[PDB]
């Protein structure tokens, strides 16, 4: 579990595209989503998921 909750060298997720943000809440949502993705775009658990 400890090795699972740690980061890796490369990115283990390539989530697809969405429509362009227009609404301000869409922009806040994009910000939050990108921050979370960067937070867990390389984590080990993501490697497990993709594999």
């Amino acid at each position: 579990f400890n090795k699972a909750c740690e980061l890796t060298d490369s990115s283990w997720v390539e989530l697809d595209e969405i429509g362009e943000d227009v609404a301000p809440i869409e922009h806040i949502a994009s910000m939050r989503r990108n921050y979370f993705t960067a937070e867990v775009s390389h984590c080990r658990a993501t490697e497990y998921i993709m594999k």
Partner: protein, 714 residues
Amino acid sequence: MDVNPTLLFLKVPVQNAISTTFPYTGDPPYSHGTGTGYTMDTVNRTHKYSEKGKWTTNTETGAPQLNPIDGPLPEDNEPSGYAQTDCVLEAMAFLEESHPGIFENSCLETMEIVQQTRVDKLTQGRQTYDWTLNRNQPAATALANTIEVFRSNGLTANESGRLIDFLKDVMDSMDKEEMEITTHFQRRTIGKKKQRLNKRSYLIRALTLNTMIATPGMQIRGFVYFVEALARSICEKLEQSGLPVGGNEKKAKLANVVRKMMTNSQDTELSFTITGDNTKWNENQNPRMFLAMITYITRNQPEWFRNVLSIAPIMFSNKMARLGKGYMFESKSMKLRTQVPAEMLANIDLKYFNKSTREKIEKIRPLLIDGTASLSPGMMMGMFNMLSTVLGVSILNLGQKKYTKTTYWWDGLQSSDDFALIVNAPNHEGIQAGVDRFYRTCKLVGINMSKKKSYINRTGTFEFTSFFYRYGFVANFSMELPSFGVSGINESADMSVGVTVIKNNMINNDLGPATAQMALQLFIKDYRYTYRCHRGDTQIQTRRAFELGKLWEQTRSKAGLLVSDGGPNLYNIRNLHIPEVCLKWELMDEDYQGRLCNPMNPFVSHKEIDSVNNAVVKSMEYDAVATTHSWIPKRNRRGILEDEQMYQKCCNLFEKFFPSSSYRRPVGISSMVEAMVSRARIDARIDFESGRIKKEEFAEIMKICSTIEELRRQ
């Protein structure tokens, strides 16, 4: 450093972070926890709880039966089903007193439902124990088979087309001296088989519960259905109930009750909340108690109504429980495996079974009749939930300060399985006395509250059917995250359903904006993978990739093509509600627009309205444009009916002559065949008149129509 997320509950209160205590997101992939041994344990424990009652011998099935009603008062805290009829009647009397006219109006609505209902409603149930073939079968096929058998046995009341007529037909059947079952052998040659069932055999088959938890036969669907209609009508008018409301109304009910009990509390009153569960709900609900409460409910009513409502508890009180497939025996010396059906379990030695199974068989042998165990006391799940809720609400309503005659008084909800009491009193002695009185009254009525699963804390926090209340904040996790994968109807239907479910979760399920965006991303990726419709530009080398590439190289406005045709995804929190074909209609190329929406394409199929732009999961409705991507996927695949599809074959060729038949339930007094005959004659005449048909076809059509007339007259 060791990761230990449970320590997180030292800062974030448990209710706030409850999402972490729910492991699975979806159905766990094992689906275990059932078997014949479990049914044996259930029967043994149910008869144990009621053991101190009277033992009688039924005059029809000859099986022993148990009667705990009006039994000796419980002396210990073990679960007891020794309910008293006088006490339940007094509780119902007080409930009517505090809600006058509820029983009467509920009875009127139930009478309306009884009068108007139809037979075909019973094709909307779940897997059903077809007694005719003596096995589980679909509701529709089981109903068709029962209708066939009744027709072959000279019972055709259900032909009228009314559910109560089918109930009268069952009434006629069960008093019949013998029942004849006919079966076909479908290969190599076809034959016939006839079987004769005496009165007792058919009687036992009618009062059986196939266990796979259990499902009764078509004999006992209608009566429970009508009793459920009555219970639902009564509960709809009760504030303390928990059914049959949805997710949004549950929060309102919880908030209302908690505010009512807390604010009304004065500065000198102490309040407590008991979050509780019932020890064993369906194992201590004696059918006689429900019969007594239904008798009280249907006082001063038409006799036919009283009897239709009273049959269900009467039928359930003498019910039989089946013992499933049987047992498996394995020998290591010769690595030899065999299956022993439960039927012979009555007359098989007790050396092949371990100690626990030996005890089970020893206890269940005296109650075993014709391979089925007679379970008079107790009940099964999923049938009398609402009436049990009514009884619980009655005992709760008994708590009003006027009844208690003392300072303490209680209230709260009841959703059958679980509940949440709230008790107000001057001192902690008052709280103790109130809880003691509530517990003793629940015991007298025959209800056991799970002492281990029930805990009491000062008012402000509790739980109720997966709804966690904390100082006004209610957290909902009854269903948890839904399934965001492609549902699997077709391309357009799956896309619309996915976007719509994301939107509905955002509106109701408190889902977040970023969470919705990620869910949309995951769904679009899953869709593209599943349907081999990857982007026309991208190279993934699927079976469909070449044609998508050619299409992409052909068109001009590549932003207009659908996702399933190799186009960009254009959804967002903005336009989740817009159907795809509309959302990018303006961008669509003229030729692609014409082809994709050509209504003469051979890939479009539409079914009856009830299955158009709607999917069954509960059911949900989606919006989509009927394009070339609305195809329907291929179908995958002892029977009383000679041709299982005779009815389906018959309804078809009606839609041909009368397309409107697909849309609205057609109504007419003429038989069908004459309807097709007249329509065909008129159509052929007008077709000849136009000039697109010649003389030979007209002559052939009229000869054929005349011949059909002669065939039907004779």
